[PDB]
Design an enzyme around this catalytic site. Structure first.
Site, PDB file in Angstrom:
ATOM      1  N   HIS A   1       0.785  -1.234   0.000  1.00  0.00           N
ATOM      2  CA  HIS A   1       0.000   0.000   0.000  1.00  0.00           C
ATOM      3  C   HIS A   1       0.820   1.289   0.000  1.00  0.00           C
ATOM      4  O   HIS A   1       0.259   2.348  -0.288  1.00  0.00           O
ATOM      5  CB  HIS A   1      -0.942   0.029   1.204  1.00  0.00           C
TER       6      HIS A   1
ATOM      7  N   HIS B   1      -6.787  -7.180  -0.484  1.00  0.00           N
ATOM      8  CA  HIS B   1      -6.865  -5.764  -0.777  1.00  0.00           C
ATOM      9  C   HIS B   1      -6.179  -5.433  -2.100  1.00  0.00           C
ATOM     10  O   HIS B   1      -5.350  -6.184  -2.632  1.00  0.00           O
ATOM     11  CB  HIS B   1      -6.235  -4.951   0.349  1.00  0.00           C
TER      12      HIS B   1
ATOM     13  N   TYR C   1      -4.232 -12.221   9.060  1.00  0.00           N
ATOM     14  CA  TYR C   1      -4.427 -11.823  10.449  1.00  0.00           C
ATOM     15  C   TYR C   1      -5.006 -12.937  11.311  1.00  0.00           C
ATOM     16  O   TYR C   1      -5.324 -12.711  12.483  1.00  0.00           O
ATOM     17  CB  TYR C   1      -5.282 -10.564  10.472  1.00  0.00           C
TER      18      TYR C   1
HETATM   19  C1  LIG Z   1      -9.822  -4.159  14.932  1.00  0.00           C
HETATM   20  N1  LIG Z   1      -9.271  -2.910  14.435  1.00  0.00           N
HETATM   21  C2  LIG Z   1      -8.795  -1.918  15.390  1.00  0.00           C
HETATM   22  C3  LIG Z   1      -9.185  -2.668  13.101  1.00  0.00           C
HETATM   23  C4  LIG Z   1      -9.619  -3.621  12.186  1.00  0.00           C
HETATM   24  C5  LIG Z   1      -9.521  -3.365  10.821  1.00  0.00           C
HETATM   25  C6  LIG Z   1      -8.990  -2.157  10.370  1.00  0.00           C
HETATM   26  C7  LIG Z   1      -8.889  -1.880   8.895  1.00  0.00           C
HETATM   27  O1  LIG Z   1      -9.281  -2.711   8.079  1.00  0.00           O
HETATM   28  N2  LIG Z   1      -8.372  -0.726   8.494  1.00  0.00           N
HETATM   29  C8  LIG Z   1      -8.244  -0.358   7.089  1.00  0.00           C
HETATM   30  C9  LIG Z   1      -6.818  -0.709   6.676  1.00  0.00           C
HETATM   31  C10 LIG Z   1      -6.754  -2.128   6.133  1.00  0.00           C
HETATM   32  C11 LIG Z   1      -5.334  -2.476   5.721  1.00  0.00           C
HETATM   33  C12 LIG Z   1      -5.060  -3.960   5.930  1.00  0.00           C
HETATM   34  C13 LIG Z   1      -3.650  -4.268   5.457  1.00  0.00           C
HETATM   35  C14 LIG Z   1      -3.653  -5.265   4.321  1.00  0.00           C
HETATM   36  O2  LIG Z   1      -3.981  -6.444   4.494  1.00  0.00           O
HETATM   37  N3  LIG Z   1      -3.272  -4.775   3.145  1.00  0.00           N
HETATM   38  O3  LIG Z   1      -3.231  -5.611   2.034  1.00  0.00           O
HETATM   39  C15 LIG Z   1      -8.556  -1.205  11.281  1.00  0.00           C
HETATM   40  C16 LIG Z   1      -8.653  -1.464  12.645  1.00  0.00           C
HETATM   41  K   LIG Z   2      -4.695  -8.236  -4.442  1.00  0.00           K
HETATM   42 ZN   LIG Z   3      -4.471  -7.295   2.679  1.00  0.00          ZN
END
Ligand SMILES: CN(C)c1ccc(C(=O)NCCCCCCC(=O)NO)cc1
Ligand SMILES: [K+]
Ligand SMILES: [Zn+2]
Ligand SMILES: [K+]
Length: 354
Positions: free
Chosen positions: A121, A158, A284
């Protein structure tokens, strides 16, 4: 042509302290080693990314700030959770992916693996989505020293927006992302309409997918897109992001994949006999991610593995059945076959331009 496994105990120790994935690095390696998979691989210690090496994508101003606030006022501009040492972890994961791309340059291996990579990202002057350095982009830029066309395949839940941003104006790197796409779902970009800009137009491929998709239909999509991309684009090297937040059990609770469906995609790619850069990413559920990338590593090695989780440091985290196999959840697939087919059609029309 034995695979390179990027590993060192200081590097896993450094990563296992990344605040959003506690001890995931060690769970992954331990599972991999308890199965003795590391004995079928050439283990290479990672270098730490030099500042010149990081600056080949990120700006000096951002690289300056990140390092300072790793040792509050101007942090918002760059999108800063400024943790003591963040710059050092970011640089170490960056060098690990560059180390792997360098082995592939030297003809040391045909497949090089940095499971602790994949932070797709991050933009050139902006942290995003818990990414501070875009080690994937860094690894592609290293591969550009030998290879004139690289194919990035991103299988995370994502959208790999950061990598697609980095090259959205060029035709020498084609980005392909399969990802959940839904209003309100991070990062909110990557529709099948998003194809790139200028000289790079039709060299971003985006496959938007809904909740609940499972192994067989994921693979039919991934193989349909990849098959055409291979003909139209003819890459000489591949970087592959295999984040595990698509797997059933993940807190993201969106896709309904198992590592066998992801592994089929990887097997189809591996059959191209090209240089290939294996990265991780999201994931996760820590043991399910450990399960997935252990299984993917066995796919790469073509070995076989018993189903019982071996006895090792983290065995207790593998409840309830203590097996390698992940079972899909009784959840609806929300993918209208005709929306999927239109997407495939649109993407074939975009590819014929290539
Ligand atoms: C339980 N808790 C505090 C949270 C749970 C989910 C997010 C979230 O999805 N935030 C948006 C950012 C998502 C990025 C995930 C990284 C990823 O897998 N990128 O590919 C935030 C806080
Ligand atoms: K992807
Ligand atoms: Zn992801
Ligand atoms: K591109």
């Amino acid at each position: 042509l034995v695979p390179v496994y990027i590993y060192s105990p200081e590097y896993v120790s450094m990563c296992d302290s990344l605040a959003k994935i506690p001890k995931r690095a060690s769970m992954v390696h331990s599972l991999i080693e308890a199965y003795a998979l590391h004995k079928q691989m050439r283990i290479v210690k990672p270098k730490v990314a030099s500042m010149e090496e990081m600056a080949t994508f990120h700006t000096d101003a951002y690289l300056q700030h990140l390092q300072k606030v790793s040792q509050h006022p101007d942090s918002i501009e760059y999108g800063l959770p400024a943790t003591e040492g963040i710059f050092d972890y970011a640089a170490a994961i960056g060098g690990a992916t560059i180390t792997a791309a360098q082995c592939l340059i030297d003809g040391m291996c045909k497949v090089a693996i940095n499971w602790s990579g994949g932070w797709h990202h991050a933009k050139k002057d902006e942290a995003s989505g818990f990414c501070y350095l875009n080690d994937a982009v860094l690894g592609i830029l290293r591969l550009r020293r030998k290879f004139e066309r690289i194919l990035y395949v991103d299988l995370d839940l994502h959208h790999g927006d950061g990598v697609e941003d980095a090259f959205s104006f060029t035709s020498k790197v084609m980005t392909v992302s399969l990802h959940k796409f839904s209003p309100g779902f991070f990062p909110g970009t990557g529709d099948v309409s998003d194809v790139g800009l200028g000289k790079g137009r039709y060299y971003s491929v985006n496959v938007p997918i809904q909740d609940g998709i499972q192994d067989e239909k994921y693979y039919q999509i991934c193989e349909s897109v990849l098959k055409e991309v291979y003909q139209a684009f003819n890459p000489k090297a591949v970087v592959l992001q295999l984040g595990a937040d698509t797997i059933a059990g993940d807190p993201m609770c969106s896709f309904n994949m198992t590592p066998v469906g992801i592994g089929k995609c990887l097997k189809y790619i591996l059959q191209w006999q090209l240089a290939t850069l294996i990265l991780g990413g999201g994931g996760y559920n820590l043991a399910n991610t450990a399960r997935c990338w252990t299984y993917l590593t066995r796919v790469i090695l073509g070995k076989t593995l018993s189903s019982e989780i071996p006895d090792h440091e983290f065995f207790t985290a593998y409840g309830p059945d203590y097996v390698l196999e992940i079972t899909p959840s009784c959840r609806p697939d929300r993918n209208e076959p005709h929306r999927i087919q239109q997407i495939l059609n649109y993407i074939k029309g975009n590819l014929k331009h290539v």
